[PDB]
Amino acid sequence: DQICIGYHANNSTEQVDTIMEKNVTVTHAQDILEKTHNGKLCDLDGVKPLILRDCSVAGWLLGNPMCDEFINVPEWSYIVEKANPVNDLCYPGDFNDYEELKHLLSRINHFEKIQIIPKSSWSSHEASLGVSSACPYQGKSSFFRNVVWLIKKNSTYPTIKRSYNNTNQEDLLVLWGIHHPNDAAEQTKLYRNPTTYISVGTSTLNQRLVPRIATRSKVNGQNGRMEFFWTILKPNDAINFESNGNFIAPEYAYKIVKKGDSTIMKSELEYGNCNTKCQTPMGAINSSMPFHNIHPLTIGECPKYVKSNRLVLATGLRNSP
Amino acid sequence: DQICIGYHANNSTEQVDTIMEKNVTVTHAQDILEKTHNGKLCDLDGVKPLILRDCSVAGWLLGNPMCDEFINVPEWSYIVEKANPVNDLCYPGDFNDYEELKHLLSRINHFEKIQIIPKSSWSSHEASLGVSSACPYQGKSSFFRNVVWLIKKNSTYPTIKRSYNNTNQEDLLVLWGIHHPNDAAEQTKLYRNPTTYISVGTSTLNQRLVPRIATRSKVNGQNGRMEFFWTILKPNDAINFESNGNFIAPEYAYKIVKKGDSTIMKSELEYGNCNTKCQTPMGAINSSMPFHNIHPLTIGECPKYVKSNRLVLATGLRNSP
Amino acid sequence: DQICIGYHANNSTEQVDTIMEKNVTVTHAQDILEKTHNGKLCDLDGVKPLILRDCSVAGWLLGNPMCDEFINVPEWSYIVEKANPVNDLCYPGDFNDYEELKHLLSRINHFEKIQIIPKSSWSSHEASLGVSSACPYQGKSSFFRNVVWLIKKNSTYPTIKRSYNNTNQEDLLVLWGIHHPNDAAEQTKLYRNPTTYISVGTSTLNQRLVPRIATRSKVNGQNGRMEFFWTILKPNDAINFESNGNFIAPEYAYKIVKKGDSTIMKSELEYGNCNTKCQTPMGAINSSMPFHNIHPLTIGECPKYVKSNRLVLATGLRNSP
Amino acid sequence: GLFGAIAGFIEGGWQGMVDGWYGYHHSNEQGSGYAADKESTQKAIDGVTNKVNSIIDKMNTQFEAVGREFNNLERRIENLNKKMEDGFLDVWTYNAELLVLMENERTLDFHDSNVKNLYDKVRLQLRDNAKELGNGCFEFYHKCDNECMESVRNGTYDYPQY
Amino acid sequence: GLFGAIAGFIEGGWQGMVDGWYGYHHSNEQGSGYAADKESTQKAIDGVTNKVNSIIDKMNTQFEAVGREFNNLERRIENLNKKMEDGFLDVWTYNAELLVLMENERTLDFHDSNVKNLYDKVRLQLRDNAKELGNGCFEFYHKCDNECMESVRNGTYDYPQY
Amino acid sequence: GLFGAIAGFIEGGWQGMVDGWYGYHHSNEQGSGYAADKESTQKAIDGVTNKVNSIIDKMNTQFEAVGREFNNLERRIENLNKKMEDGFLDVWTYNAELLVLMENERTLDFHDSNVKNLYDKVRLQLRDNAKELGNGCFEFYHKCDNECMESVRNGTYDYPQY
Ligand SMILES: *[C@@H]1O[C@H](CO)[C@@H](O[C@@H]2O[C@H](CO)[C@@H](O[C@H]3O[C@H](CO[C@H]4O[C@H](CO)[C@@H](O)[C@H](O)[C@@H]4O)[C@@H](O)[C@H](O[C@@H]4O[C@H](CO)[C@@H](O)[C@H](O)[C@@H]4O)[C@@H]3O)[C@H](O)[C@H]2NC(C)=O)[C@H](O)[C@H]1NC(C)=O
Ligand SMILES: *[C@@H]1O[C@H](CO)[C@@H](O[C@@H]2O[C@H](CO)[C@@H](O[C@H]3O[C@H](CO[C@H]4O[C@H](CO)[C@@H](O)[C@H](O)[C@@H]4O)[C@@H](O)[C@H](O[C@@H]4O[C@H](CO)[C@@H](O)[C@H](O)[C@@H]4O)[C@@H]3O)[C@H](O)[C@H]2NC(C)=O)[C@H](O)[C@H]1NC(C)=O
Ligand SMILES: *[C@@H]1O[C@H](CO)[C@@H](O[C@@H]2O[C@H](CO)[C@@H](O[C@H]3O[C@H](CO[C@H]4O[C@H](CO)[C@@H](O)[C@H](O)[C@@H]4O)[C@@H](O)[C@H](O[C@@H]4O[C@H](CO)[C@@H](O)[C@H](O)[C@@H]4O)[C@@H]3O)[C@H](O)[C@H]2NC(C)=O)[C@H](O)[C@H]1NC(C)=O
Ligand SMILES: *[C@H]1O[C@H](CO)[C@@H](O[C@@H]2O[C@H](CO)[C@@H](O[C@@H]3O[C@H](CO)[C@@H](O)[C@H](O)[C@@H]3O)[C@H](O)[C@H]2NC(C)=O)[C@H](O)[C@H]1NC(C)=O
Ligand SMILES: *[C@H]1O[C@H](CO)[C@@H](O[C@@H]2O[C@H](CO)[C@@H](O[C@@H]3O[C@H](CO)[C@@H](O)[C@H](O)[C@@H]3O)[C@H](O)[C@H]2NC(C)=O)[C@H](O)[C@H]1NC(C)=O
Ligand SMILES: *[C@H]1O[C@H](CO)[C@@H](O[C@@H]2O[C@H](CO)[C@@H](O[C@@H]3O[C@H](CO)[C@@H](O)[C@H](O)[C@@H]3O)[C@H](O)[C@H]2NC(C)=O)[C@H](O)[C@H]1NC(C)=O
Ligand SMILES: CC(=O)N[C@H]1[C@H]([C@H](O)[C@H](O)CO)O[C@@](OC[C@H]2O[C@@H](O)[C@H](O)[C@@H](O)[C@H]2O)(C(=O)O)C[C@@H]1O
Ligand SMILES: CC(=O)N[C@H]1[C@H]([C@H](O)[C@H](O)CO)O[C@@](OC[C@H]2O[C@@H](O)[C@H](O)[C@@H](O)[C@H]2O)(C(=O)O)C[C@@H]1O
Ligand SMILES: CC(=O)N[C@H]1[C@H]([C@H](O)[C@H](O)CO)O[C@@](OC[C@H]2O[C@@H](O)[C@H](O)[C@@H](O)[C@H]2O)(C(=O)O)C[C@@H]1O
Ligand SMILES: *[C@@H]1O[C@H](CO)[C@@H](O[C@@H]2O[C@H](CO)[C@@H](O)[C@H](O)[C@H]2NC(C)=O)[C@H](O)[C@H]1NC(C)=O
Ligand SMILES: *[C@@H]1O[C@H](CO)[C@@H](O[C@@H]2O[C@H](CO)[C@@H](O)[C@H](O)[C@H]2NC(C)=O)[C@H](O)[C@H]1NC(C)=O
Ligand SMILES: *[C@@H]1O[C@H](CO)[C@@H](O[C@@H]2O[C@H](CO)[C@@H](O)[C@H](O)[C@H]2NC(C)=O)[C@H](O)[C@H]1NC(C)=O
Ligand SMILES: *[C@@H]1O[C@H](CO)[C@@H](O)[C@H](O)[C@H]1NC(C)=O
Ligand SMILES: *[C@@H]1O[C@H](CO)[C@@H](O)[C@H](O)[C@H]1NC(C)=O
Ligand SMILES: *[C@@H]1O[C@H](CO)[C@@H](O)[C@H](O)[C@H]1NC(C)=O
Ligand SMILES: *[C@@H]1O[C@H](CO)[C@@H](O)[C@H](O)[C@H]1NC(C)=O
Ligand SMILES: *[C@@H]1O[C@H](CO)[C@@H](O)[C@H](O)[C@H]1NC(C)=O
Ligand SMILES: *[C@@H]1O[C@H](CO)[C@@H](O)[C@H](O)[C@H]1NC(C)=O
């Protein structure tokens, strides 16, 4: 008669690593690393992202005629932009402090576009001929929809002195610009005055832009350049414009109605018709694992990213052969 | 007759955590995390901090008339500034490279103010009417005490050509500025000349400032703006000014006599009449613990900051009930 | 008769540390930290570094006459520059975006210098008298070899309108500059025209430089200043110059033929006539250790840097006395 | 393993013991079979469960990367940003992988220890009333029927009675 | 615990043993009482003390945050700065908390091991001159007076004499 | 050590045992000598070797500093860069030093455990055919010649034969 002491074995082939031994077969183990995703861009807890598709943030905000899909976009959870969107600045140039603005958008979930300087209210200047073949719409020469390219009227460009007041409660994103013409002849042809400027003032801002003449390469068929600028106009503050040529005036500006958690995600993927609590640039994640290895840039309630291929904890004991 | 082997127990209720078990009662333990502070701003090893109170670094350095307490401050250990000091730039404007200067102060413990261009030595310009209602002192219009706001004398502003030489052994902090008037009428009213400049030169510096006219919002009752600039003048080097208007000239500059460990601390607290070897923005620390959890930004010989609520090491053994 | 169980001892004096006990003598141990280097700068897998010796990156690239050793340098593995090279900008001034350019060099292993605007091709301007005593060569006044300092010819400086086209396959580093004269008399003496500019245009670039007059300290005997600028000219893109004075024109530019892993190392050491797979600023490393403590900035296949004085793993067991 | 029981003096585990991690096998005239030791098994389940949760909990506060863009003349800070992000990922990857390796070793040893202690608990009861065979088993000098066997598992084996 | 002694085959500690972490209790015709084992106790005090100092020392070189300010158009690098500072605090917080959890486990097991070894040291002396009761105690076959008891604590218990 | 064998009940190691980490010494009428236990020795060499490689491997992906220069008015980001670089070096220095301290402790204990288990393997064979002396040795009740000794090292010591 005997009594023996012993331990459990089973048919398990699960393996764990240790410092002194790799591939130890154990009776039970627990994987803690999520390796799968759905490969789609999804709504984040019901709230759909802004998918700019072929438009860039600049094309969207300035109102590139090719980006009319985004003329009035609802509240978003995150933003998705391709690596090299084709519809950026149709008319060539620069967007000043562009990256600082994009960073500002990571704290914004909703814009409401409003009209601050009506197109018709330009009585001493021509405001309906500010177009170019570089920004076509339906086969015709058009232009950035949110700013007005003003030119001389009856052979004169009188000094502009406009002011807008932020009466509404929400911070306002105001966008304007300046045209750099190709030569002295083009300058007088469009604006009469040879030496011009645009002065912009707010509570904080004290700007004075001057056009910069230069022989330049053609880009999208244009020699001229457009340099765009922006500011955040506080509540109860007024923006003050003064110019005698080359002024690209604001028509529409954006109210910042919702602030909060957001991000600009770089991805070539389109919309997936899908929902998730955790999103990455290559697909959404749905699991209870404490870790994943899909991609470091996530948004939502996510597991923690690690660069491992495998994380498996032993729970049971060394299994017998 | 028997002999038994055993171990110590006592009345201890101290608890430690382990990976497999929480709240294990042990006979002895050692807390290693400091959780308390005195809630005061204190001298650091005898050396009192510079407590700017309602003044900012700019108000202090430029000599805002409300900041006369700090007209000649002794050596400090660290600097304490509120989050939003009221006495900053009384006359509205900007302070150029302000954050880079504040960073420079974290390596400075003592300034000695000296006179480089006497106020009386301006014989061809009016130097005693450079005042504003925005910078009041005792009910009267005054101005930043360390710089001279020069205006036309007997209806003329002749070109200024001044030079100062750093003969003394210590690097010199020189501060000047430029006035941006509201309109063309104000420009001629103060400075005669319509188009003006300020050119500044040192061994390295090659600056040319031009005023920027613009209709602007009123700030502290002023339309005009002041933009201030600075430089570090090496020993044996000369700073060269040339201007024909809008020049805010240096009167007093600061010698950098003591360099060393310092910091600018953000805190609403005032002076505590106290001494310590370790200071945080919410109070001083006096303990032998290797860790604390009060605040990450400290100065002095401090424990290491962690975000824990509790760090307790077992020394003794598992206590019996 | 007996049988005993026991373990190995030997004459070893090797010691390892543990959490509870320091300096435990063990039968066997394995050092894992490399502490030695050869104290020399060496070839990296056969490929010699660029050792600028007394020249800086600016002196080398602009073609400081004292830096003729580096007029045509072969492919390098890494670059070595002293902390304060004497031969930098012989004629005083600035090098714009200098640090961003140096960062660009850490991704470059080979330049091939080519001629883009021949010196002789300046038919309306004097191009052979653009020299200074600050940049001597063999006792005579010379100048940066890669750029041409143009001055008036027969009492006139007509407007310059030059263009270069990047026909070759490789990105091109183009360097130019602008002269800031001491006074209005010097301006007319060299360039006739009192008010001048240099406008530069590419696909992206839209620059307009204006000289800045100012009384300045003498540096290397000069009152004037030279401010140098640069750009990367893409393939199939053209750079467009226009100026009427103060223009320091490109003669030679650099083709970027090899991109890849490189670095700029700060070191006072000269060439060691040596080879290695791992290099540091104070000497090369040759070992199989997983760690070293020589210096954090290395290049090549190196061990990992730690700040330890000692890392020794126990392999054997506690040795008996 | 460190404690010598699992795949040591006990050569292998038991496919036949289904209801616990550790336990007993008995053999007498009435028959034979397996019985799980509830107490040691449950102590093991609690320890391993606390461990897993402890591991998950400690890694819950960890670096999260965010998107930042930089223009063509901000390459230095772009590179700084890249190296910072990557640096923290490498630190956390190391932390996770090492914790798993280290605690897997401790978990396997923990089980070995629980088996060894169970074997000793029984050895200390039987004392000289049974031959210690050397393989996990004790061979009795007296007939040990099922209630005798139960008493050994009880902790109640009345030594003086035999 | 891993070694089976503390709250294992020795059910609980002794309020009565004041002058050491581990020791002996004896009972005979002359009386009874506790005696601390100086050597094992002092080895324990040295180990735990070295551990604490080792922990303190390793954490002495650790990240210190510094104040840096940024203007309204330097938000990206301000954010970079914030994430860097926070990242290191999270790393060091993790390191501290984990070290404490791990070494607390090792410290408790260390004590258990010292008790187990002390029990074995005595077991290996007495051999067959005493009944191993199963609870930390040995019951002698001969009368063991106080000097007999002292010899067991000595390491000198003359086995052949009994 | 935790397992009580090395510099515990076995006072010291053997200069005379050259061909292994652990083994046997025998003494009888025919003579005496040392013999290494191949199996436990080789298990030890494999474990320590895997450990070293595991340590080397885990530290292979670690922060590498790069040169970045900044002008006189970029002191803030220069400082940010410095603090980032240094921060990671301090983290990796800590990781390396702690891993070495912790695993050195585990390695020493591992050896102690292997010795203890070897001693138990032999104890469980001899059972009552030998006096357990208390110092690592077993004194036989019968004459044990060299082939008798070999059988103890074998794992084959025929207990019932004696
Ligand atoms: C700096 O100089 C460079 C090099 O000279 C300039 O780039 C060149 O610009 C010229 C125009 O100024 C272009 O000319 C033409 O070439 C294309 C070639 O088309 C195909 O064939 C070639 C085979 O050699 C192949 O390599 C190309 O990839 C391509 O498949 C012509 O097609 C084009 O003519 C077109 O004809 C079509 C109908 O036939 C029309 O619809 C089009 O509208 C168009 O007129 C044209 O004649 C060069 O292609 C171009 N690149 C070279 C030579 O490598 C560069 O522009 C200049 N810089 C600046 C800023 O201008
Ligand atoms: C862009 O437009 C906005 C909106 O119009 C401008 O802000 C507004 O500026 C005007 C002056 O141009 C201010 O007018 C007055 O309003 C205050 C209100 O005082 C109290 O009552 C209201 C109740 O509606 C309450 O909301 C306020 O919070 C406050 O408690 C008057 O007190 C003030 O008159 C004063 O009278 C005092 C004696 O009675 C005097 O001592 C004072 O010196 C002063 O004269 C004045 O009449 C608006 O308050 C102001 N905000 C609004 C309407 O929301 C903004 O200035 C403009 N931009 C720029 C750059 O100018
Ligand atoms: C701001 O003002 C400062 C202070 O005045 C200017 O620095 C000073 O500049 C002057 C010239 O403007 C220099 O004058 C001379 O001094 C040196 C001194 O030489 C030795 O002796 C002194 C002892 O007092 C010692 O401290 C020095 O270190 C040195 O060993 C003269 O040698 C020099 O004259 C030379 O004579 C040589 C033949 O004898 C010639 O070959 C040389 O070419 C040269 O003519 C000269 O007379 C001061 O040295 C200098 N520093 C002072 C006084 O501390 C500074 O220049 C100004 N700023 C700007 C931007 O100009
Ligand atoms: C663990 O197991 C032992 C042995 O199996 C238990 O002892 C046995 O306990 C049972 C149930 O209490 C006893 O049954 C009783 O029998 C008497 C007369 O035979 C009867 O009057 C009662 O109604 C009941 O049926 C049994 O006698 C007893 N046998 C022995 C040998 O002890 C013990 O209770 C268990 N202990 C623990 C801590 O689980
Ligand atoms: C540990 O304890 C044992 C037993 O208590 C010690 O042995 C005893 O040691 C004492 C003191 O040395 C002896 O006392 C001596 O007695 C003789 C004659 O009786 C006398 O001539 C001496 O002046 C002295 O008083 C005692 O005899 C002795 N007894 C026995 C049974 O051994 C032992 O010394 C201790 N060993 C260690 C390592 O601490
Ligand atoms: C471990 O050691 C034991 C004892 O040394 C081994 O047993 C011995 O094995 C040898 C070699 O196989 C035997 O030798 C044989 O002897 C017989 C007759 O004497 C002869 O017919 C054969 O040709 C051979 O020479 C020896 O008898 C035997 N002795 C005993 C006492 O068992 C055993 O084989 C070893 N086991 C292992 C697992 O290594
Ligand atoms: C408001 C206005 O003047 N629009 C013009 C525009 C501007 O004058 C010019 O872009 C300013 O730099 O120029 C347009 O013509 C230029 C255009 O001419 C085509 O024939 C050709 O296809 C193109 O290469 C280009 O040179 C323009 O389309 O942009 C006309 C527009 O009405
Ligand atoms: C040196 C000088 O000219 N000081 C003037 C000052 C400047 O002319 C002006 O600030 C330049 O921009 O203007 C002062 O008057 C402006 C002031 O007028 C008050 O009536 C009113 O209370 C204010 O709103 C403001 O418009 C000034 O006080 O700043 C007078 C000063 O002497
Ligand atoms: C192209 C040209 O004009 N070269 C001149 C040069 C420039 O005019 C000047 O640097 C522009 O700022 O000036 C040179 O003379 C200046 C020189 O005079 C010496 O006598 C003296 O030794 C120096 O201190 C310095 O003032 C020059 O050498 O740079 C002459 C050169 O030909
Ligand atoms: C541990 O087991 C894993 C099995 O997953 C081994 O990994 C594979 O090794 C084979 C070599 O025969 C390769 O062909 C495969 O590519 C590997 N697969 C993966 C997913 O890594 C691993 O080699 C084993 N390690 C040790 C030390 O034995
Ligand atoms: C370990 O004990 C601590 C006691 O400090 C427990 O923490 C408290 O838990 C109670 C729940 O009854 C809460 O109401 C308190 O707010 C907690 N206090 C603190 C300071 O945390 C803890 O819950 C216990 N943990 C476990 C796993 O048993
Ligand atoms: C462990 O041993 C080392 C020997 O390398 C000791 O380090 C030396 O300590 C002496 C003190 O007598 C100093 O004078 C030397 O400068 C030390 N040398 C080095 C390289 O550090 C160390 O002190 C010992 N540590 C302990 C705790 O005993
Ligand atoms: C392994 O055994 C389990 C019993 O727990 C059973 O559910 C499963 O079907 C078996 N699988 C294989 C492959 O034998
Ligand atoms: C998430 O995955 C689980 C699998 O555990 C699945 O049952 C469930 O459908 C998924 N939930 C969502 C919201 O996609
Ligand atoms: C606990 O016991 C200690 C003896 O070490 C004594 O000093 C203390 O007063 C006691 N405290 C309580 C609450 O019993
Ligand atoms: C620091 O705290 C200790 C308590 O340990 C106290 O005795 C002492 O007064 C304090 N020292 C100072 C300088 O405040
Ligand atoms: C130590 O012993 C080894 C044998 O492994 C021998 O090679 C060496 O010469 C000896 N060294 C000393 C200093 O005794
Ligand atoms: C590297 O060091 C080894 C020493 O292990 C030496 O034998 C060899 O010559 C060295 N190799 C080179 C390429 O310098």
PDB file of C-alpha atoms in Angstrom, chain A residues 1-11 16-20 24 26-28 30 32 81 99 102 263-264 266 290-291 296-297 304-309 311-320, chain D residues 6-7 10 12-15 17 20-28 48 52 55 59-60 62 65-66 69 71 89-90 93 97 100-101 104-105 107-108 111 122 133 136-140 143-144 149:
ATOM      1  CA  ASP A   1       0.000   0.000   0.000  1.00  0.00           C
ATOM      2  CA  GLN A   2       1.340   3.413  -0.967  1.00  0.00           C
ATOM      3  CA  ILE A   3       0.485   7.053  -1.320  1.00  0.00           C
ATOM      4  CA  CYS A   4       2.301   9.244  -3.827  1.00  0.00           C
ATOM      5  CA  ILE A   5       2.664  12.974  -4.251  1.00  0.00           C
ATOM      6  CA  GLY A   6       2.502  14.387  -7.768  1.00  0.00           C
ATOM      7  CA  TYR A   7       1.423  17.125 -10.115  1.00  0.00           C
ATOM      8  CA  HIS A   8      -0.737  17.817 -13.147  1.00  0.00           C
ATOM      9  CA  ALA A   9       0.114  17.107 -16.771  1.00  0.00           C
ATOM     10  CA  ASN A  10      -1.977  17.517 -19.900  1.00  0.00           C
ATOM     11  CA  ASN A  11      -1.886  17.565 -23.725  1.00  0.00           C
ATOM     12  CA  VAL A  16       7.097  29.983 -22.540  1.00  0.00           C
ATOM     13  CA  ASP A  17      10.623  31.403 -22.392  1.00  0.00           C
ATOM     14  CA  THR A  18      12.786  31.961 -19.300  1.00  0.00           C
ATOM     15  CA  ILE A  19      16.264  33.445 -18.748  1.00  0.00           C
ATOM     16  CA  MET A  20      17.917  30.007 -18.530  1.00  0.00           C
ATOM     17  CA  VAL A  24       9.602  25.288 -22.013  1.00  0.00           C
ATOM     18  CA  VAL A  26       3.745  24.293 -19.851  1.00  0.00           C
ATOM     19  CA  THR A  27       0.310  22.996 -18.868  1.00  0.00           C
ATOM     20  CA  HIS A  28      -1.176  26.497 -19.042  1.00  0.00           C
ATOM     21  CA  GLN A  30      -1.589  33.283 -21.070  1.00  0.00           C
ATOM     22  CA  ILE A  32      -0.787  39.030 -23.310  1.00  0.00           C
ATOM     23  CA  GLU A  81      -4.488  62.480 -44.336  1.00  0.00           C
ATOM     24  CA  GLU A  99       2.943  72.544 -38.839  1.00  0.00           C
ATOM     25  CA  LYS A 102      -1.737  71.156 -37.767  1.00  0.00           C
ATOM     26  CA  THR A 263      -5.030  63.495 -33.923  1.00  0.00           C
ATOM     27  CA  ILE A 264      -3.877  63.671 -37.539  1.00  0.00           C
ATOM     28  CA  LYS A 266      -1.105  59.406 -41.823  1.00  0.00           C
ATOM     29  CA  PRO A 290      -2.583  44.653 -22.038  1.00  0.00           C
ATOM     30  CA  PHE A 291      -0.155  44.938 -24.996  1.00  0.00           C
ATOM     31  CA  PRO A 296       2.768  53.079 -31.937  1.00  0.00           C
ATOM     32  CA  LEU A 297       0.452  55.942 -33.007  1.00  0.00           C
ATOM     33  CA  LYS A 304       0.247  49.513 -24.759  1.00  0.00           C
ATOM     34  CA  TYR A 305       2.472  49.288 -27.792  1.00  0.00           C
ATOM     35  CA  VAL A 306       5.631  47.167 -27.672  1.00  0.00           C
ATOM     36  CA  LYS A 307       7.984  46.010 -30.458  1.00  0.00           C
ATOM     37  CA  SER A 308       7.780  42.308 -29.404  1.00  0.00           C
ATOM     38  CA  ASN A 309       6.684  39.438 -31.620  1.00  0.00           C
ATOM     39  CA  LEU A 311       4.712  37.872 -24.927  1.00  0.00           C
ATOM     40  CA  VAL A 312       3.439  34.741 -23.170  1.00  0.00           C
ATOM     41  CA  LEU A 313       3.229  34.291 -19.376  1.00  0.00           C
ATOM     42  CA  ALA A 314       3.383  30.884 -17.731  1.00  0.00           C
ATOM     43  CA  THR A 315       0.450  30.222 -15.414  1.00  0.00           C
ATOM     44  CA  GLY A 316       0.690  26.468 -15.100  1.00  0.00           C
ATOM     45  CA  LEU A 317       3.680  24.246 -14.579  1.00  0.00           C
ATOM     46  CA  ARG A 318       6.278  22.407 -16.656  1.00  0.00           C
ATOM     47  CA  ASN A 319       4.422  19.828 -18.721  1.00  0.00           C
ATOM     48  CA  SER A 320       5.671  16.251 -19.036  1.00  0.00           C
TER      49      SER A 320
ATOM     50  CA  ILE D   6       9.008  18.716 -10.545  1.00  0.00           C
ATOM     51  CA  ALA D   7      10.913  16.688 -13.163  1.00  0.00           C
ATOM     52  CA  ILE D  10       9.125  13.165  -9.181  1.00  0.00           C
ATOM     53  CA  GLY D  12       6.754  13.399 -14.407  1.00  0.00           C
ATOM     54  CA  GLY D  13       3.246  14.750 -13.956  1.00  0.00           C
ATOM     55  CA  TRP D  14      -0.062  12.868 -14.067  1.00  0.00           C
ATOM     56  CA  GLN D  15      -2.468  12.980 -17.012  1.00  0.00           C
ATOM     57  CA  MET D  17      -5.122  14.114 -12.118  1.00  0.00           C
ATOM     58  CA  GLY D  20      -5.957  20.228  -9.404  1.00  0.00           C
ATOM     59  CA  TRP D  21      -2.358  21.255  -9.952  1.00  0.00           C
ATOM     60  CA  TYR D  22      -1.025  19.080  -7.128  1.00  0.00           C
ATOM     61  CA  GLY D  23      -2.323  16.099  -5.224  1.00  0.00           C
ATOM     62  CA  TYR D  24      -2.095  12.462  -4.229  1.00  0.00           C
ATOM     63  CA  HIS D  25      -2.264   9.042  -5.803  1.00  0.00           C
ATOM     64  CA  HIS D  26      -3.062   6.055  -3.581  1.00  0.00           C
ATOM     65  CA  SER D  27      -2.869   2.273  -4.061  1.00  0.00           C
ATOM     66  CA  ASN D  28      -4.229  -0.397  -1.723  1.00  0.00           C
ATOM     67  CA  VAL D  48      -0.404  33.296 -10.270  1.00  0.00           C
ATOM     68  CA  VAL D  52      -0.694  38.407 -13.867  1.00  0.00           C
ATOM     69  CA  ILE D  55       2.110  42.685 -14.353  1.00  0.00           C
ATOM     70  CA  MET D  59       2.487  48.374 -17.479  1.00  0.00           C
ATOM     71  CA  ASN D  60      -0.752  50.443 -17.669  1.00  0.00           C
ATOM     72  CA  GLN D  62       3.492  53.750 -20.174  1.00  0.00           C
ATOM     73  CA  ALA D  65       3.540  58.366 -29.057  1.00  0.00           C
ATOM     74  CA  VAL D  66       1.884  61.388 -30.701  1.00  0.00           C
ATOM     75  CA  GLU D  69       5.226  67.197 -38.220  1.00  0.00           C
ATOM     76  CA  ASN D  71       9.214  71.233 -42.283  1.00  0.00           C
ATOM     77  CA  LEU D  89       9.440  52.224 -27.118  1.00  0.00           C
ATOM     78  CA  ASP D  90      12.758  50.383 -26.762  1.00  0.00           C
ATOM     79  CA  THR D  93       9.767  46.770 -24.977  1.00  0.00           C
ATOM     80  CA  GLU D  97      10.155  41.223 -22.333  1.00  0.00           C
ATOM     81  CA  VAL D 100       7.947  38.105 -18.675  1.00  0.00           C
ATOM     82  CA  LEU D 101      11.217  36.114 -18.789  1.00  0.00           C
ATOM     83  CA  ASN D 104       8.047  32.939 -15.961  1.00  0.00           C
ATOM     84  CA  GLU D 105      11.138  31.581 -14.222  1.00  0.00           C
ATOM     85  CA  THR D 107       6.285  30.938 -11.728  1.00  0.00           C
ATOM     86  CA  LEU D 108       7.799  27.587 -12.728  1.00  0.00           C
ATOM     87  CA  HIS D 111       4.992  25.340  -8.649  1.00  0.00           C
ATOM     88  CA  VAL D 122       3.244  14.252   4.067  1.00  0.00           C
ATOM     89  CA  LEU D 133      10.815   5.181  -1.872  1.00  0.00           C
ATOM     90  CA  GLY D 136       7.405  10.835  -4.627  1.00  0.00           C
ATOM     91  CA  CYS D 137       5.878   7.763  -2.983  1.00  0.00           C
ATOM     92  CA  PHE D 138       5.639   6.333   0.498  1.00  0.00           C
ATOM     93  CA  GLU D 139       5.099   2.612   1.012  1.00  0.00           C
ATOM     94  CA  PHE D 140       3.259   1.827   4.259  1.00  0.00           C
ATOM     95  CA  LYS D 143      -2.380  -1.892   5.652  1.00  0.00           C
ATOM     96  CA  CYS D 144      -3.676   1.579   4.805  1.00  0.00           C
ATOM     97  CA  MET D 149      -5.450   7.230   3.069  1.00  0.00           C
TER      98      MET D 149
END
